Amino acid sequence: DVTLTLWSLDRDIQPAPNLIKEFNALNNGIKIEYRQLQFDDVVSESMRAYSTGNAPDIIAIDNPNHAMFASRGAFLDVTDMIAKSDVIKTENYFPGPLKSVTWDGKYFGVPKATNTIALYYNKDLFKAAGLDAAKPPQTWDELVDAARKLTNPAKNVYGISFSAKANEEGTFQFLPWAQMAGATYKNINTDGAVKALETWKTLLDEKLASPDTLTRSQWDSTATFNAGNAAMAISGPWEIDRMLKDAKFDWGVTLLPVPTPDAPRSSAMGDYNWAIFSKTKHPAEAFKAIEFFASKDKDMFKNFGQLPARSDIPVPPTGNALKDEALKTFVEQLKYAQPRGPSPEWPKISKAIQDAIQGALSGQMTPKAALDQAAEKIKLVDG
Numbered sequence: 001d002v003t004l005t006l007w008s009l010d011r012d013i014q015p016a017p018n019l020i021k022e023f024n025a026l027n028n029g030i031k032i033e034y035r036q037l038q039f040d041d042v043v044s045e046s047m048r049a050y051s052t053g054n055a056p057d058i059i060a061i062d063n064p065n066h067a068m069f070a071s072r073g074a075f076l077d078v079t080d081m082i083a084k085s086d087v088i089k090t091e092n093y094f095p096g097p098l099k100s101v102t103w104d105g106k107y108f109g110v111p112k113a114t115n116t117i118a119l120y121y122n123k124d125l126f127k128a129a130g131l132d133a134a135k136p137p138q139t140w141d142e143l144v145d146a147a148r149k150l151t152n153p154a155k156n157v158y159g160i161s162f163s164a165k166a167n168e169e170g171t172f173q174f175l176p177w178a179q180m181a182g183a184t185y186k187n188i189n190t191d192g193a194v195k196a197l198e199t200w201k202t203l204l205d206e207k208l209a210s211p212d213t214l215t216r217s218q219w220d221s222t223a224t225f226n227a228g229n230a231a232m233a234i235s236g237p238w239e240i241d242r243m244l245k246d247a248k249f250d251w252g253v254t255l256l257p258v259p260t261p262d263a264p265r266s267s268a269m270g271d272y273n274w275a276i277f278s279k280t281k282h283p284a285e286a287f288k289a290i291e292f293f294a295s296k297d298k299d300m301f302k303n304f305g306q307l308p309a310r311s312d313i314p315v316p317p318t319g320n321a322l323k324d325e326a327l328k329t330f331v332e333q334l335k336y337a338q339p340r341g342p343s344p345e346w347p348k349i350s351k352a353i354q355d356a357i358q359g360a361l362s363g364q365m366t367p368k369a370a371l372d373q374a375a376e377k378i379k380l381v382d383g
């Protein structure tokens, strides 16, 4: 057998290790060995290994990071193998995810999945508060007022859970708010962005969300929602399968609230891409693995609660009512997602935003001053 290595942050209930077991059962002359990483080490460990000369054959890399690796020669050019494939067809992919694997008019990967965030809410807690569980918040003012009402320290319930962590988590969570208010990462200090950050400050200052929001991932924040300790959660479709097992209450999912009713929804394009490292000894076999993964995209939502990056396979209902309402909301919200980049410098853009968020939420800087500084940094690093 040819033995390949594959690195991903996917855990046991997530696609990669399960796809790998199915691939290995084919006994097709190829075997894959898996390494499970943490979010915060996918880039660092990946780039260390490539620099050291022992990168894996395959990685699942977060879409905003793809351009850095591709621009640096770390990823194999898969343009010609994609052209020969009928399993992997560029026509199948949503434009944004496909663009994220491209660099200099060549393909340097294949999208794995796509996502964005939306608003989960605990319908039982809504009802108990005298709110209308059929009419979740539509505006930021409604969201904040609901969060005030639903904050119940007597039962250690926060009105909302989210993430402002000083890494990609916080940037991915903030950009929708800023974008809905008219800003972009290229123009992050508009008055609307300032209002977004002031609104985050309210959620924390008024103890409507945990102080741990500043240091905790979306995944770990949502676990508190599942446990009944946050009435609402801003997170992605990757929560669904775990939520169905863990949340012991009735829940719904709605579009992200907007700053005023005349503002359209907007968010950041989430999820990962497959890539092959450029010095693989086994390019054909690694590509065949990726083809096998793509051939199973049709079953990703039913098996894992994640969404394919593809227009050719619209996701069918599962038959689970909670899961299917989640699907409907996320499929809609996804249409309004915007890419982070392309930029080989994405981490520096994101750090500027992260620093603004931390500075304002701590009270050390005003939102305006924090974001003005981020915008200055971004002018430099995004040039």
Ligand SMILES: OC[C@H]1O[C@H](O[C@H]2[C@H](O)[C@@H](O)[C@@H](O[C@H]3[C@H](O)[C@@H](O)[C@H](O)O[C@@H]3CO)O[C@@H]2CO)[C@H](O)[C@@H](O)[C@@H]1O
Pocket: 009, 010, 011, 014, 038, 039, 062, 063, 115, 168, 169, 170, 172, 217, 218, 219, 220, 236, 238, 269, 270, 271, 272
């Ligand atoms: O943080 C910004 C990124 O948010 C989204 O990433 C998701 C992952 O897609 C998802 O798999 C999940 O990752 C967790 C992983 O499943 C788990 O085993 C582990 O212990 O922690 C991982 C990190 O939490 O959750 C993260 C969000 O926390 C989005 O897909 C990505 O594009 C964003 O950049």
